[PDB]
């Protein structure tokens, strides 16, 4: 199921629109975007695991992942409202 | 850049897509499907594109805004 295989080339889009009929150009582009979205998802699925293994080897073995999407940003945080827009003056 | 993901910053829509550009009534047909190209090292599909339209020439009419304004400035 791993994408990193020669059998799976990023070139599975050439023989797509060769023969069949095409309609108003709004939905084939959406189909391509959806397919690339799927490809990116299965790419990241093992990219994260590879990063976890690399970090575990590089540092202390115990490593745990946690999804930090916007719903979590509500969790404890720090705010230097003043020093908020970090910049260099002078 | 870290503070952007820490805070609610980023994630906003761009400004390019606000302007509405597009075409209507587009006519579409099959590519040539022959592979003779002087660049034999490249992929098969790129060769098919090249034969249909031919080799590019004059390197100026093609926009490439990196060099078009440089050529204008030189002239």
């Amino acid at each position: 199921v791993s994408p990193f295989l020669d059998s799976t080339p990023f070139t599975t889009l050439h023989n797509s629109l060769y023969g069949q009929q095409i309609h108003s150009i709004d939905d084939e582009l959406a189909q391509i975007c959806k397919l690339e979205y799927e490809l990116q998802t299965q790419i990241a699925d093992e990219q994260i695991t590879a990063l976890k293994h690399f970090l575990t080897i590089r540092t202390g073995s115990p490593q745990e992942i946690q999804y930090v999407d916007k719903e979590w940003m509500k969790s404890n945080q720090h705010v230097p409202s003043f020093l908020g827009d970090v910049k260099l003056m002078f | 850049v870290v503070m952007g993901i820490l805070n609610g910053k980023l994630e906003a829509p761009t400004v390019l897509e606000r302007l509405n550009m597009g075409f209507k009534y587009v006519v579409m047909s099959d590519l040539k499907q022959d592979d003779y190209s002087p660049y034999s090292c490249q992929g098969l599909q790129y060769r098919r594109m090249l034969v249909h339209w031919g080799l590019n020439d004059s390197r100026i009419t093609s926009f490439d805004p990196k060099g078009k304004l440089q050529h204008l400035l030189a002239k």
Binding site: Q21, I22, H23, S24, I25, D26, D27 | G22, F23, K24, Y25, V26, V27, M28, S29, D30
Partner: peptide, 12 residues
């Protein structure tokens, strides 16, 4: 839906 696209039927 927004960009109309036509094609040749069988002269291709």
């Amino acid at each position: 839906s927004a960009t109309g696209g036509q094609a040749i039927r069988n002269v291709g």
